[PDB]
Amino acid sequence: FTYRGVDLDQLLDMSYEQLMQLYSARQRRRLNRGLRRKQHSLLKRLRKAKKEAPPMEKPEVVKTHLRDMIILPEMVGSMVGVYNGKTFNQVEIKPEMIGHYLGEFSITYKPVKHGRPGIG
Amino acid sequence: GHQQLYWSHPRKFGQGSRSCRVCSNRHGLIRKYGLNMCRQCFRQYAKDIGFIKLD
Amino acid sequence: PGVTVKDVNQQEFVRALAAFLKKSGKLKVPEWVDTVKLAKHKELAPYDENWFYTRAASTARHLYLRGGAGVGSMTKIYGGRQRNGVMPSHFSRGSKSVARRVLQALEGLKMVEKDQDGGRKLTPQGQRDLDRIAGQVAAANKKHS
Amino acid sequence: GSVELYAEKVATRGLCAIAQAESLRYKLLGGLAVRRACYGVLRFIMESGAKGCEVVVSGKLRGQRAKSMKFVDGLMIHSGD
Amino acid sequence: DIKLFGKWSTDDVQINDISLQDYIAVKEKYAKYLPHSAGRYAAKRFRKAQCPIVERLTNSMMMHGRNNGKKLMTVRIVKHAFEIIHLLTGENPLQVLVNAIINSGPREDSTRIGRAGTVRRQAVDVSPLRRVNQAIWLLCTGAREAAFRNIKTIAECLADELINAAKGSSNSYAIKKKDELERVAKSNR
Amino acid sequence: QSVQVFGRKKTATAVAHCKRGNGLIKVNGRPLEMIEPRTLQYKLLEPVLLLGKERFAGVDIRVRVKGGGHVAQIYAIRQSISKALVAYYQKYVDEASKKEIKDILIQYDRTLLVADPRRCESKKFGGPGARARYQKSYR
Amino acid sequence: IHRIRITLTSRNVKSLEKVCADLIRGAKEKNLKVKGPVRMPTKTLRITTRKTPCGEGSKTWDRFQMRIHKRLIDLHSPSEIVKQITSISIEPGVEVEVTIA
Amino acid sequence: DKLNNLVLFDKATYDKLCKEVPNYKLITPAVVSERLKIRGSLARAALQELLSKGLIKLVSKHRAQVIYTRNT
Amino acid sequence: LVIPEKFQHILRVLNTNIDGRRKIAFAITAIKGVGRRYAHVVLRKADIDLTKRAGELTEDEVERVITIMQNPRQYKIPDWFLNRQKDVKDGKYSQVLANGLDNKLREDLERLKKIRAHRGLRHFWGLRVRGQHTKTTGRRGRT
RNA sequence: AACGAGACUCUGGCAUGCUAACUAGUUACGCGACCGGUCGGCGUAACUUCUUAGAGGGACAAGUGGCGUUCAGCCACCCGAGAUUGAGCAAUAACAGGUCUGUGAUGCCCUUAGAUGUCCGGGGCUGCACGCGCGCUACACUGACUGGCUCAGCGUGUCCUACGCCGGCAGGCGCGGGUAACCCGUUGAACCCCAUUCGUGAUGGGGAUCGGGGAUUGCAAUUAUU
Ligand SMILES: [Mg+2]
Ligand SMILES: [Zn+2]
């Protein structure tokens, strides 16, 4: 994988500002403004989930209601439950989505399957 | 525990941040002059307020 | 009777000063002049490569006829009509940078002097220059006819 | 100390609309019948020498239908400044 | 002296018909310098009988949507149209407006009688003011349709349609619609 | 030797100052021929060419016009200069020559010494414009 | 002492003008030099609201107005004669404001 | 039918512009461009050359509308 | 006026067929990756005059305009004039032309399809991706 | 005779007569500038034509001439700012019109501590094979673009924003004025006006749909807020 001519090793090991600089201006807008309490908490709990993980097995499912939370490169490989609003849904973080919002992976809705119209 | 989350939010702006000063309703507020009433209670009291209908 | 700026067609004047600025030889031209629009309200970059000298001409005469016109007023002077998509047309201002540094270059060439009322009015020297271009152009136009 | 309350009797209380409509409400609240009390307030304010008046009571009178009773007396003006 | 657009002469022109002599303007007094007087001729009935004929051709040239509010587009276009006309025929361009008005106007016209959906027309005859008005309409519309995309200037195309409306040729969209009206008038009678 | 007037058309206001002089007539800092529509040139000199140049030979008018639109402002200067030469002829000249000026200016255009009372109406709700309204649909 | 300024704001012109006349006349009788009425541009508050409560209407629009009038009167005199002519002459419907020098 | 006009002049067409147009009474760039099958810019600049040659009288000019007359 | 003897009626640049009897900038605009705006930039950079029709240009001017457009950042073509500012993999500033534009489109579709995101689902089912109201409109082209 | 129509209130048009204005200007005189003028440039006396806004005048079919049981009134003309200013308010009655969702305005029904309560965190009113509706924008030559020249009014403001400096553009920084005829603001708004480039083809007309980037707002923008 490559992000701005930079791999996953350098990304993780890079300081937070050097992570910030390669994201678009939109991610930079929410990052330079800082990340909040309820987000640093989820960051910390996915850390403890990834650290307690078995050798070949992926960390314990950490459920979350934060769709708006940006995906840091440190969640790569971590199982994230994203709340669609009915049901906790199953997200598996890959390296390509490190720029995207956690939310969009969880669909908002059931896709419309049409049928014949009716009297009105 | 529960005391932190009862009012947990920055409501300093928005529609629900504002209420008419008579009927306690946030629907259709007149914000112009610091009136802060929904249209209906404004239209009821306009005499004493000194809003005359000249037009 | 010495043809001060206002007795002449103003577009002939702006055609004159645009050339006088290039013949003089002293002006500071942006590295980005060829690059950009003159405003957000415009699509295509100006056809004439003289756009900075003729815009400095226009700027010069608008500050000739009015003092106290600064960056906000230099941005307020150029009316654009922006047609947005399927949405109606609305009014747009000019470019701060280019109007303001036309005035900064004019402050560097000792034309413009900085007023006590906050704006910028022409020097005695700059006014001499403007009624000089006015003279040579009015004279050429009334004699050739 | 910057507020001072002074109560003053309204001189002719028949010729106050608010006052006698208030007494109309209060008297209907007495359990008094519609017709007798309204004809009383009407006849009173009329007698007070006011060029004309009208009284309209609308709501539940008889049963679950919706009634509006209207008693009109003397001259009346409506449109116009 | 009063000279139209600075180079013309209004008082030398002529009217050959009695019906259109009482209506068509710019002979004796009404002759002006410029078309736009911004006066009120729709104020009262037949008060628009007396306004300058050149202004009358002028008012009707804004008649489609984008050109609507802009009057000056016309006093521009009517300016170059006259100066073109004088080059072709070689006569007072205000004689060419008279002849085009006189010839383009209908004579007899049809009025629709029946029930809606069934057109059965009966022939009646045009009133003088109506003749002037319909005529000028026809002139401006002939100019538009002819000038939409031929890439002709409307100056060029109106001088065209006007001179042709004056000569009596079938080139003019005007003379065409007139000739149809009169012919339907014949059909019914 | 000094006389002052004002022209009016719609929202456009003109102010004409007449002093004894060489016949200089300027508008807000420029002669008659520098005005914005050059198509509208001839409407500006209309009283001039009507009144003759001799009567303007002894009259210096400085004109200040602000308000309204472009077109309106030329009607404004027209108004200003016409009203000027009629109102100056009253005080510093006789009433005979004012009657000459007036009989010449009146039979051509009534708008020379008078203004049109008419001005924009008020658009009211229920429509896009003064009268004009929104569409409606049945069915 | 010089340049004392009185600012009047009121809802209706009737009550207002009579007070301005009381002050200019009452101060002119003590021979305090007076800069007379100066009448500021009428400031209006226009409110357009939807007549009906539920909007089943023809889309009808109530136009409410309220007009405020602001006048100024300038006096040249000691503070005492002004504070006394103001405190003695008072009228309902009008609100008064005093600025000095 | 689709329209082909000449972008830059041809010798054939140039004989027409050169030897003919001065006899035409009323001359308009659209008139020239119609009878000679020239394009717009080329015909316009053609009359701009027939200006510098002195073969054509210029009556008036406004924006995109131009008026030309034959010499005497 | 002029009568050019050597004139290219059909031109070829960057896999595309260019019409040169047209004007110059608006002939160059025909290819993908260029609008009127970037065309005025490249042709004001190459010193090529805008008065010439696109068929009067010598091979040296076509080759130096080509050379200007392949290599954007060397010629002082501003970084904000580039089609793709920072690409997702290499992190470089590159001006994207016809075949490269189409390819980058295809690829940025494939990435979002393999990732399992909403932009890509949208782009997959044939829906407008910007969150447009699809109730009323977004019909034409459908059965 | 009475209500409804009118009258009336609100707005526009008239006033070189009146009442006046340093928080609006004018004329006059000084200084300032560049060639007797041009200048929103700086200050003092002069006054109200301009600019405001009060008082009160003015239009009443009035004057003249035509059509009229010469009656109402209807037409034309003059004298004139105006011979039609635009809105508000709206009777006796009714609708089984819309309004539990504007009301600390309610009569009943239900809900009442795993609440139909309320607050907290997410989703949803925005979804898409389809119909029906207001409305935007265009289909170009009276047009698009590019430079240049001079125009409004109603209102909004503790947020409007003067002038600098950094910024290609959005934007940052800053240093200032105004509870306002004082400061934004001589509110240099759009056509239009004058030159320029384009040349009848999906064209520079039209710009939807998209792929990348910068900046703002906000806790929070992915379901593109802009
Ligand atoms: Mg009424
Ligand atoms: Zn309320």
Coordinates of C-alpha atoms (C1' of nucleotides) in Angstrom, one line a residue, chain J residues 20-158:
Chain J
rA20 C1' -35.8 75.3 10.2
rA21 C1' -31.1 72.0 10.6
rC22 C1' -22.8 70.9 12.4
rU23 C1' -26.0 64.5 12.4
rA24 C1' -27.8 66.9 5.3
rG25 C1' -26.1 70.0 1.9
rU26 C1' -25.8 74.7 -0.8
rU27 C1' -23.7 79.5 -2.4
rA28 C1' -19.6 82.8 -1.2
rC29 C1' -14.5 83.4 0.5
rG30 C1' -10.0 81.6 1.8
rC31 C1' -5.9 77.8 1.6
rG32 C1' -4.4 73.0 -1.4
rA33 C1' -3.3 70.9 -6.4
rC34 C1' -2.6 70.2 -11.8
rC35 C1' -2.5 72.3 -16.3
rG36 C1' -9.4 80.8 -16.0
rG37 C1' -11.5 76.0 -14.8
rU38 C1' -11.0 70.7 -12.7
rC39 C1' -11.1 68.2 -8.0
rG40 C1' -15.8 64.1 -2.3
rG41 C1' -9.6 68.2 -0.9
rC42 C1' -9.4 70.9 4.0
rG43 C1' -11.5 74.7 6.7
rU44 C1' -15.3 79.0 7.7
rA45 C1' -19.4 83.1 7.4
rA46 C1' -24.6 82.2 3.7
rC47 C1' -29.1 80.2 3.0
rU48 C1' -32.8 76.3 2.4
rU49 C1' -33.4 75.8 -4.5
rC50 C1' -31.2 70.5 -3.6
rU51 C1' -31.5 67.0 1.3
rU52 C1' -34.8 65.7 5.3
rA53 C1' -40.4 66.9 7.5
rG54 C1' -43.6 69.4 9.8
rA55 C1' -47.6 73.1 9.3
rG56 C1' -51.0 74.1 5.8
rG57 C1' -52.4 75.0 0.8
rG58 C1' -54.0 72.2 -4.0
rA59 C1' -58.8 69.0 -7.5
rC60 C1' -64.0 70.0 -6.9
rA61 C1' -65.6 67.1 -13.5
rA62 C1' -63.1 72.6 -12.1
rG63 C1' -63.1 75.9 -16.8
rU64 C1' -64.7 76.0 -22.1
rG65 C1' -67.1 73.3 -26.0
rG66 C1' -70.1 68.8 -27.6
rC67 C1' -73.8 63.9 -26.4
rG68 C1' -77.8 63.8 -22.9
rU69 C1' -86.3 63.5 -20.7
rU70 C1' -80.1 69.3 -21.2
rC71 C1' -81.3 65.1 -15.3
rA72 C1' -77.6 62.2 -13.7
rG73 C1' -73.9 61.9 -15.8
rC74 C1' -70.9 60.5 -20.5
rC75 C1' -66.8 62.7 -24.5
rA76 C1' -63.2 66.3 -26.4
rC77 C1' -60.2 70.4 -25.3
rC78 C1' -57.5 74.1 -22.0
rC79 C1' -55.9 76.0 -17.5
rG80 C1' -52.6 72.9 -14.3
rA81 C1' -47.8 69.4 -10.3
rG82 C1' -52.3 65.9 -10.6
rA83 C1' -58.7 65.3 -14.9
rU84 C1' -57.3 56.9 -13.9
rU85 C1' -51.6 56.7 -6.9
rG86 C1' -51.1 51.9 -4.9
rA87 C1' -52.5 49.1 -0.3
rG88 C1' -55.5 48.6 4.7
rC89 C1' -60.0 48.3 7.2
rA90 C1' -64.6 45.4 5.4
rA91 C1' -72.5 44.5 6.6
rU92 C1' -76.8 41.1 7.7
rA93 C1' -75.5 36.2 7.4
rA94 C1' -73.8 31.5 6.9
rC95 C1' -69.7 26.9 5.7
rA96 C1' -70.8 20.9 10.1
rG97 C1' -63.9 25.2 5.2
rG98 C1' -58.2 25.1 7.7
rU99 C1' -56.5 25.1 13.2
rC100 C1' -55.6 19.4 19.6
rU101 C1' -49.1 20.7 15.8
rG102 C1' -48.7 28.7 17.8
rU103 C1' -51.1 29.1 22.9
rG104 C1' -49.6 28.2 31.2
rA105 C1' -56.2 28.6 25.3
rU106 C1' -59.4 23.6 26.3
rG107 C1' -64.3 19.6 26.8
rC108 C1' -63.4 14.0 26.3
rC109 C1' -60.0 9.5 25.3
rC110 C1' -55.3 7.3 26.2
rU111 C1' -50.7 7.4 28.2
rU112 C1' -48.8 7.4 33.1
rA113 C1' -41.6 4.7 36.0
rG114 C1' -39.1 -1.7 31.1
rA115 C1' -43.9 6.1 30.4
rU116 C1' -46.9 8.1 24.3
rG117 C1' -42.2 11.8 29.8
rU118 C1' -37.6 13.9 29.3
rC119 C1' -32.8 14.1 28.2
rC120 C1' -28.0 11.4 26.2
rG121 C1' -25.6 8.9 21.2
rG122 C1' -26.3 7.5 16.6
rG123 C1' -29.5 6.9 12.3
rG124 C1' -34.3 8.8 9.6
rC125 C1' -37.7 13.5 7.3
rU126 C1' -32.9 13.9 1.8
rG127 C1' -33.9 7.8 0.3
rC128 C1' -35.7 5.9 -6.4
rA129 C1' -38.1 1.8 -12.0
rC130 C1' -42.6 6.1 -11.6
rG131 C1' -46.9 9.8 -12.2
rC132 C1' -48.7 15.3 -11.0
rG133 C1' -47.3 20.4 -9.2
rC134 C1' -45.0 25.9 -8.3
rG135 C1' -39.7 27.8 -9.6
rC136 C1' -35.0 28.2 -11.4
rU137 C1' -31.8 28.1 -16.3
rA138 C1' -31.2 27.9 -21.2
rC139 C1' -31.6 27.0 -26.1
rA140 C1' -27.2 32.2 -28.8
rC141 C1' -25.8 37.4 -33.7
rU142 C1' -31.3 42.4 -29.8
rG143 C1' -25.9 36.8 -28.5
rA144 C1' -21.3 34.7 -25.3
rC145 C1' -16.5 36.5 -23.9
rU146 C1' -12.6 40.3 -22.8
rG147 C1' -11.2 45.2 -21.2
rG148 C1' -13.0 50.2 -20.6
rC149 C1' -17.1 54.5 -19.1
rU150 C1' -20.6 56.0 -15.5
rC151 C1' -26.1 54.7 -12.4
rA152 C1' -30.0 53.0 -7.7
rG153 C1' -33.5 52.3 -3.3
rC154 C1' -35.5 49.8 0.7
rG155 C1' -33.6 48.4 4.5
rU156 C1' -30.2 45.6 7.9
rG157 C1' -26.0 46.3 12.2
rU158 C1' -22.4 45.0 19.3

